[PDB]
Design a protein around this ligand. Structure first.
Ligand code: ZN
Length: 601
DNA sequence: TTT
């Protein structure tokens, strides 16, 4: 166990300056801020920890204020002495999720530079699916060392202490150990990270630079109108009441809108085919099947849809408004997805209905501040463009090249008719095929998504591959090397290890092969999106225009732009995104603006 | 992910 003998507690300036001096000449050093809250914008710095060498670490408490806390260097004094080191881009720091720490220092007007290594990201890039990338997991997996957990020194549940309440020495064991271990983790992973140029390229030029940019995005937050959401909520309550009646009115008596219990004894008991509908879900939905004619399942279907939306966004969002900023600050997770795409939580921006009227009403709540407008810059069907590239298909590429709708272009080729005549059903069919390929779906699954018989769908796929051969090759070639080397790469070098690529298991291995085909396109989209964020943020930081990047969701970047700078800014954002990222994939950036996110979306 |  870690005792009080392992690390020093710095309580005097002289000792701090001595450490600063050593830190200044160290090649790299681990750094971490201790605070009184997870909420970055409102958190107060409570202490700082540093590790200069394995086994050599210190904790500097500055704002522990429990009853009779011993004297500590003051926060302002510690920070003024540390500021130079922290803002020196030449002083390289190592840390665990430095995005957090960068933000905390930003509450004090300090701009952390030299953000060179993040062990969370080192781990993530080495093998995204190896397991969780939190430090407790990393310490165990890479060093067979069990770190003191936050719950171990602070407690659990509502009665969990905030770090400033923890005794100086106990706080030190926890924080200094974290610093020491972070440096050790770095010393083990960094050498590994260079066994391959692809992962190294992604780590160095994409993930690390993105660290401060995500901090800025999160800290900027988004402006949401609580009234709009509340009115939406009141309304949904009403509609839910109306819908519950129309359900009672279509049938007899009352009942819960829970199928396989009350519904099955209604819907089919009043004729229909016995199978219900799993809310398994996005492949088998008999409720909406019947919905095309049977009125009850259609209302049950919408009832649930609004119920989920209301309790997830309409009633939640307003409560996420931060009292200190009056804005909402989503949590971006940079090391969680298997493919490399950023994920978002509280709120989860990506689960807000795109093609739905209610989803749009939610986005109407994301408003621009006075004299500003919301600007949306989206990469039009980037993953389809990436496949065209990865497939080297002159046909798909040409379609994009002449600005034609690729779904109608594809239909014209598969069904063999003039582009102008392609019907909605045919476009819908080519669309299902195209997106089916990205997820590497089978002819049978496609049949289930287009409601056509098996082999009929296979008939369509054979025609597709015949008209677009380069796609089948890519797929065969990608499933191939996947088994050859156990992983697939993105254009930049990002890797997705596929352990079950030879699982001798049924589904599990089928899943691995699908991931093999998809990852390279979805992963390349992610690298492209991150590189865009980095390029735009660099311009923002350098030119200092009147714009804030406020969100990243799916394939779009969202901003607040001063109403009088819109055109010059829209132009610049547009050029940076489709011309200052990768030059090999045919990219198209759609830019829109409006008073709210829906207007610009 | 961080405190
Ligand atoms: Zn352009």
């Amino acid at each position: 166990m870690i005792s009080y003998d392992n690390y020093v507690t710095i309580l005097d300036e002289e000792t701090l300056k001595a450490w600063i001096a050593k830190l200044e000449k160290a090649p790299v050093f681990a750094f971490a801020t201790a605070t009184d809250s997870l909420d970055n914008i409102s958190a107060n710095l409570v202490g700082l920890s540093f590790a200069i060498e394995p086994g050599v670490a210190a904790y500097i408490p500055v704002a522990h204020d429990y009853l009779d806390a011993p004297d500590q260097i003051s926060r302002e004094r510690a920070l003024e002495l540390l500021k130079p080191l922290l803002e020196d881009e030449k002083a390289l720091k190592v840390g665990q999720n430095l995005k957090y720490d960068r933000g905390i220092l930003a509450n004090y007007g300090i701009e952390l530079r030299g953000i060179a290594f993040d062990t969370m990201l080192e781990s993530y890039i080495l093998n995204s699916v190896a397991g969780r990338h939190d430090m407790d997991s990393l310490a165990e997996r890479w060093l067979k060392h069990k770190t003191i957990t936050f719950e171990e020194i602070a407690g659990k549940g509502k009665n969990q202490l905030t770090f400033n309440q923890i005794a100086l020495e106990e706080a030190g064991r926890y924080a200094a150990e974290d610093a020491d271990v972070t440096l050790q983790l770095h010393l083990k992973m960094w050498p590994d990270l260079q066994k391959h140029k692809g992962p190294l390229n992604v780590f160095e030029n994409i993930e690390m630079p993105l660290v401060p940019v995500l901090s800025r995005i999160e800290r900027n937050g988004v402006k949401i109108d609580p009234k709009v959401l509340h009115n939406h909520s009141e309304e949904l309550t009403l509609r839910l009441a109306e819908l519950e009646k129309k359900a009672h009115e279509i049938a007899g008596e009352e009942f819960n809108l829970s199928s396989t219990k009350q519904l099955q004894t209604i819907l089919f008991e009043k004729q229909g085919i016995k199978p219900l509908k799993k809310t398994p879900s996005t492949s088998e939905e008999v409720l909406e099947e019947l919905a095309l004619d049977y009125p009850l399942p259609k209302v049950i279907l919408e009832y649930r849809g609004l119920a989920k939306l209301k309790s997830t966004y309409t009633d939640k969002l307003p409560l996420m408004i931060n009292p200190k900023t009056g804005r909402v600050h989503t949590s971006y997770h940079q090391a969680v997805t298997a493919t490399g795409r950023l994920s978002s939580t509280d709120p989860n921006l990506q689960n807000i209905p795109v093609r739905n009227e209610e989803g749009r009403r939610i986005r109407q709540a994301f408003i621009a501040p006075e004299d500003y407008v919301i600007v949306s810059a989206d990469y039009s069907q980037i993953e389809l463009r990436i496949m065209a590239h990865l497939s080297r298909d002159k046909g798909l590429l040409t379609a994009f090249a002449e600005g034609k709708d690729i779904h109608r272009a594809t239909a014209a080729e598969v069904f063999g008719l003039p582009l102008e005549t392609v019907t909605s059903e045919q476009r819908r069919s080519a669309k299902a095929i195209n997106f089916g390929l990205i997820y590497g779906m089978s002819a049978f699954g496609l049949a289930r998504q287009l409601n056509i018989p098996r082999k009929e769908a296979q008939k369509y796929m054979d025609l597709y591959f015949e008209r677009y051969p380069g796609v089948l090759e890519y797929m065969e070639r990608t499933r191939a090397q996947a088994k050859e080397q156990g992983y697939v790469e993105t254009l930049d070098g990002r890797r997705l290890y596929l352990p079950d690529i030879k699982s001798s298991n049924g589904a599990r291995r089928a899943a691995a092969e699908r991931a093999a085909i998809n990852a390279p396109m979805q992963g390349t989209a992610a690298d492209i999106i991150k590189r865009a964020m980095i390029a735009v943020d660099a311009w923002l930081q350098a030119e200092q225009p009147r714009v804030r990047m406020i969100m990243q969701v799916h394939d779009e970047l969202v901003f607040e732009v001063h109403k009088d700078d819109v055109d010059a800014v829209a132009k610049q954002i547009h050029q940076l995104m489709e011309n200052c990222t990768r030059l090999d994939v045919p990219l198209l950036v759609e830019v829109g603006s409006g008073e709210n996110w829906d207007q610009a979306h």
